[PDB]
Design goal:
The PDB classes it as ribosome. The entry lists the keywords 40S, Nsp1, betacoronaviruses, cryo-EM, ribosome. The entry is titled "SARSr-MpCoV-GX Nsp1 bound to the Human 40S Ribosomal subunit-State1". Chain A is Small ribosomal subunit protein uS7. This is part of a larger assembly, with chains A, B, C, D, E and F. By secondary structure, chain A is mainly α. Chain A has a single domain (4-187), classed as Ribosomal protein S7/S5 (Ribosomal Protein S7, Orthogonal Bundle), CATH 1.10.455. Chain A has helices at 53-59, 71-79, 82-89, 94-99, 129-145, 158-165, 174-186; strands at residues 109-111, 122-124. Chain C has one helix spanning 2-5, and strands at 6-14, 19-27, 47-48. Chain C contains 1 helix and 3 strands. Chain D contains no helices and 4 strands. Chain D is mostly beta strands. By secondary structure, chain F is mainly alpha-helical. In chain F, helix 5 (99-107) links the parallel strand 2 and strand 3. The chains are: A mainly alpha, B mainly beta, C mainly beta, D mainly beta, E alpha+beta, F mainly alpha. The interface between A and D is medium-sized, with 25 and 22 residues. Strand 3 of chain C pairs antiparallel with strand 1 (38-39) of chain F. Chain E binds one RNA strand through helix 3.
RNA sequence: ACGAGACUCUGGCAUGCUAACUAGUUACGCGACCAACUUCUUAGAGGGACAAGUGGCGUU
């Protein structure tokens, strides 16, 4: 009866490996029924890295100057029509839910060279979190512009957001923008 | 000569034990002293299946107390902390009954006279006073007073005549009757500090504590020097057997038990847990509280763990 | 500590040439009681009570005539 | 392009005209463990695990 | 004979008057999940279904809930339920049941016992706010 | 940064040297004894002094530190200064002596000694470090 | 010896303490079965944090 949410559970989702919990980590007090836990992610570096990627995903829509930070907005977004989709799907959306975004992710970004010259960039990488969530931030911009002056709006992209959340395969768009940049800057190895 | 065997462990607490006090007349109230506004009860079971049960958590005390003393009757607990305050607790009501704020200086100890006649406290005016319950001046001695703070005043720990045994941290020991209160002998220039003095049940000994560990032994009529029992670091506990003549104290890691005819330990056989890290410092022991007569012993440390053992005495 | 350890006086002296201003600052000594100086010490000053000379024999032995 | 798990041993510092890249040294755990240095970006904390998708990218130092 | 530390957080508060009686739980001064702002009902639904009715079968609760601010009085309701349960079990039954159930509740989440210490800071010297300064010309 | 200034450092050194008896390893006990045996006019400074006293107690529990001259460690060191072996290290039955020092002793009127064993001189004159 | 620190003021924390007829209340209480030795607010002699504990780097 320690089952996560009212629907999920922590007793059947096992990987038999304790090296691959960098995307979903539900084993302690950090498990959240609803992400409105408050908190400050800018108090110190390595704390926005300590974020749960669900919370970072939903909150990082805090952009423009008028919709910035308002946690009521993100909690209402992730509650509304998620309450509908849970009873409207019945089956498992897990396949796409994981299999587009959470290994669409790139594998390298770049850095500046020497002291001058804005014509190419030395290819580097990070332990996956920073690069995946930089793709996530550019995807925040991308999903916004897919809503911003567009047709599919906010508080109704719950399918695509669960995709942007969960675990491991490749179909994304701003991530393939990042992968074009990946190859271009990776020609320097 | 005493053989014991550790039989178990105890898990679950918040406040490590500091001071010990019990009355054989009423054994239903057992108390423990802590540092987090916390006082915890015990009970007696002597079971391996159940060697401890958290039942009642006494609160109320704003400051971490120094010496807790119970009256002859197991009904009143006096916990006066390091400000001059006090807490009077009665089991008849389960709350506070008498809160006194009357001393404007930093007092360290408070005690009940065994005959419930006068109240003694240590003040920083180079003077000792005797106080009543009516707030009326009785006896203030300005001459030949202690060189520094008066630690406390002790009385007999059992059903026997009360004798005033004044103690201080200024390494001065005074024992006064109820009639004379006359300074007989004074000796100064001592190597180690004085923690506190203790009262003997047979009325011939008064040991003391200090970092030098040298047990101070004086008679009752005068200040004749008798013997200097050895010791370890700062001593915080001394007590005899209730019917037999022995000295037991815990001035550090191990147990320092001396028989006054032998004065030395016999055989130190102990049980300590193993640590997998080369830099994990073990805790520090303070006191050994006999359960009822010397058959069983309890102890507490700085590891949120309470260590107990079963002793056969002989 | 400059608020209660230093007392300041600024005064004007009028000469035929003009005005010269004088400024006298005194750092009071620490003294309990007497109102000669402030009661509290300098907050960066830590005090220790000093022991006395102890040249004693190995063991105390009572002496009687 | 194998995926290898390596632990950060030391953090060297930043580079650039104004400072825009980070240097760490990562050591392999299951590839006949040896010390290899590589520049990096973003929060790569004290002694974390840096994933090598490739064993040939080096850090050109100074 | 006065055991109350009530329930507060941030700006709001709730006087936890916990007393022995019939044993029904009074929450919100209103039916359980219809709160008019509607924003944060589900957080109240975690413990009341987690623990069970028998644990709170003797708790008569009377709370004066006040204060504007969702993050204040919300999550203070959960601070109050945890703390009232703690005090009730401590003063009435034992400490072992207290540590067990309190551990469950405060190991579900930490943010109960700790509020944000963040406060608006002073408008500083020669600027519109705490750190911003008026534009400098040359 | 958390660098302790001369005030707390010197106060801790004096407190440890003068009342090494009472201080322990716990911050709370060190705090209480530091408050008792010193007039520290601030509580933040008292806490800083007690913390450095705990740190230095850990330091001296693992050996001698130069800033503090506690009497127990000085007594131990002085006891080590009086250690004398059972037989003098100079009481060798045989002393190995080169031929040239034997000739010197002969010129020194000490040539009849039987403790001396004449060793073979090293046939290599290679005693200087190569230059470069 | 100054300056730096310490210091003063200010925030942030009390199943603690000192008590309020301007906040706050218990089954011989009504206007209703069809004088709680004081805690949310206020403010005091105090407490609390020290790089203190652990791990790793540092003529350790």
């Amino acid at each position: 009866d320690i089952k996560l949410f009212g629907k999920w559970s922590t007793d059947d989702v096992q990987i038999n490996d304790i090296s691959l919990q960098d995307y979903i980590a539900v084993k302690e007090k950090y498990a959240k029924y609803l992400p409105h836990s408050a908190g400050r992610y800018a108090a110190k570096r390595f704390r926005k890295a300590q974020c749960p990627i669900v919370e970072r995903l939903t909150n990082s829509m805090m952009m423009h100057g008028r919709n910035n930070g308002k946690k009521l907005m993100t909690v209402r977004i992730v509650k509304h029509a998620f309450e509908i989709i849970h009873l409207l799907t019945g089956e498992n959306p897990l396949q796409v839910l994981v299999n587009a975004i959470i290994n669409s992710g790139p594998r390298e970004d770049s850095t500046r060279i020497g002291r001058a010259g804005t014509v190419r960039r030395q290819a580097v990488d990070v332990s996956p979190l920073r690069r995946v969530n930089q793709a996530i931030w550019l995807l925040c911009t991308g999903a916004r512009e897919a809503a911003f002056r567009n047709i599919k709006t906010i508080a109704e992209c719950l399918a695509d957001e669960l995709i942007n959340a969960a675990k491991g395969s490749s179909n994304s768009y701003a991530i393939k923008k990042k992968d074009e940049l990946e190859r271009v800057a990776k020609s320097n190895r | 000569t005493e053989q014991m065997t550790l039989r178990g462990t105890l898990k679950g607490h918040n406040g490590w034990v500091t001071q010990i006090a019990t009355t054989p007349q009423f054994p239903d109230m057992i108390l423990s002293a802590s540092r987090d506004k916390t006082i915890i009860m015990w009970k007696l079971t002597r079971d391996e299946t159940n060697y401890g049960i958290p039942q009642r958590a006494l609160r109320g005390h704003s400051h971490f107390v120094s010496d807790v003393v119970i009256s002859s009757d197991g009904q009143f607990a006096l916990s006066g902390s390091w400000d001059g305050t006090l807490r009077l607790w009665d089991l008849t009501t389960g709350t506070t009954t008498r809160r006194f704020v009357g001393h404007t200086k930093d007092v360290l100890s408070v005690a009940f006279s065994s005959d419930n006649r006068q109240i003694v406290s240590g003040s920083r005016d180079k003077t000792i006073k005797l106080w009543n319950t009516l707030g009326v001046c009785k006896y203030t001695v300005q001459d030949e007073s202690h060189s520094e703070w008066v630690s406390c005043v002790r009385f007999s720990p059992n059903s026997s005549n009360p004798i005033i045994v004044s103690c201080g941290w200024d390494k001065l020991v005074k024992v006064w009757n109820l009639a004379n209160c006359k300074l007989k002998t004074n000796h100064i220039g001592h190597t180690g500090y004085l923690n506190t003095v203790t009262v003997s049940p047979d009325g011939s000994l008064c040991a003391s504590g200090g970092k030098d560990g040298q047990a101070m032994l004086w008679d009752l009529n005068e200040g004749k020097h008798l013997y200097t029992l050895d010791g370890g670091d700062i001593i915080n506990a001394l007590c005899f057997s209730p019917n037999r003549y022995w000295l037991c104290a815990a001035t550090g890691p191990s147990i320092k038990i001396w028989d006054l005819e032998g004065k030395i330990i016999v055989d130190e056989l102990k049980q300590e847990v193993i640590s997998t890290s080369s830099k994990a410092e073990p805790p520090q022991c303070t006191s050994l509280a006999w359960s009822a007569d010397g058959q069983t012993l309890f102890a507490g440390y700085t590891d949120n763990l309470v260590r107990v053992w079963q002793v056969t005495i002989g | 500590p400059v608020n209660y350890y230093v007392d300041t006086a600024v005064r004007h002296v009028l000469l035929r040439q003009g005005v010269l201003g004088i400024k006298v600052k005194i750092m009071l000594p620490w003294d309990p009681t007497g109102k000669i100086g402030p009661k509290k010490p300098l907050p960066d000053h830590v005090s220790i009570v000093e022991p006395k000379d102890e040249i004693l024999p190995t063991t105390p032995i009572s002496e009687q005539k | 392009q194998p995926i290898k798990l390596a632990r950060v041993t030391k953090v060297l510092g930043r580079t650039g005209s104004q400072g825009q890249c980070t240097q760490v040294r990562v050591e392999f755990m299951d590839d006949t463990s040896r010390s290899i240095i590589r520049n990096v970006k973003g929060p790569v904390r004290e002694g974390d695990v840096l994933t090598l998708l490739e064993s040939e990218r080096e850090a050109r130092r100074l | 004979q006065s055991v109350q530390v009530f329930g507060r957080k941030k700006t709001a508060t709730a006087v936890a008057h916990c007393k022995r009686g019939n044993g029904l739980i009074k929450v919100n001064g209103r039916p359980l999940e219809m709160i008019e702002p509607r924003t944060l009902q589900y957080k109240l639904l975690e413990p009341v279904l987690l623990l069970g009715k028998e644990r709170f079968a003797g708790v008569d609760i009377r709370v004066r809930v006040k204060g504007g601010g969702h993050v204040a009085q919300i999550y203070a309701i959960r601070q109050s339920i945890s703390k009232a349960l703690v005090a009730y079990y401590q003063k009435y039954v034992d400490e072992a049941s207290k540590k067990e159930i309190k551990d469950i509740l405060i190991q579900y989440d930490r943010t109960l016992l700790v509020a944000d210490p963040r406060r608006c800071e002073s408008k500083k010297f020669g600027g519109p706010g705490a750190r911003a300064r008026y534009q400098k010309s040359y | 940064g958390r660098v302790r200034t001369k005030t707390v450092k010197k106060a801790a050194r004096v407190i440890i040297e003068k009342y090494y008896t009472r201080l322990g390893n716990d911050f709370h006990t060190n705090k209480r004894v530091c408050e008792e045996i010193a007039i520290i006019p601030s509580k933040k400074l008292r806490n800083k002094i007690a913390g450095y006293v705990t740190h230095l107690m850990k330091r001296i529990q693992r050996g001698p530190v130069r800033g503090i001259s506690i009497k127990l460690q000085e007594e131990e060191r002085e006891r080590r200064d009086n250690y004398v072996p059972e037989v003098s290290a100079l009481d060798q039955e045989i002393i190995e002596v080169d031929p040239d020092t034997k000739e010197m002793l002969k010129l020194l009127d000490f040539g009849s000694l039987s403790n001396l064993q004449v060793t073979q001189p090293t046939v290599g004159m290679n005693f200087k470090t190569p230059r470069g």
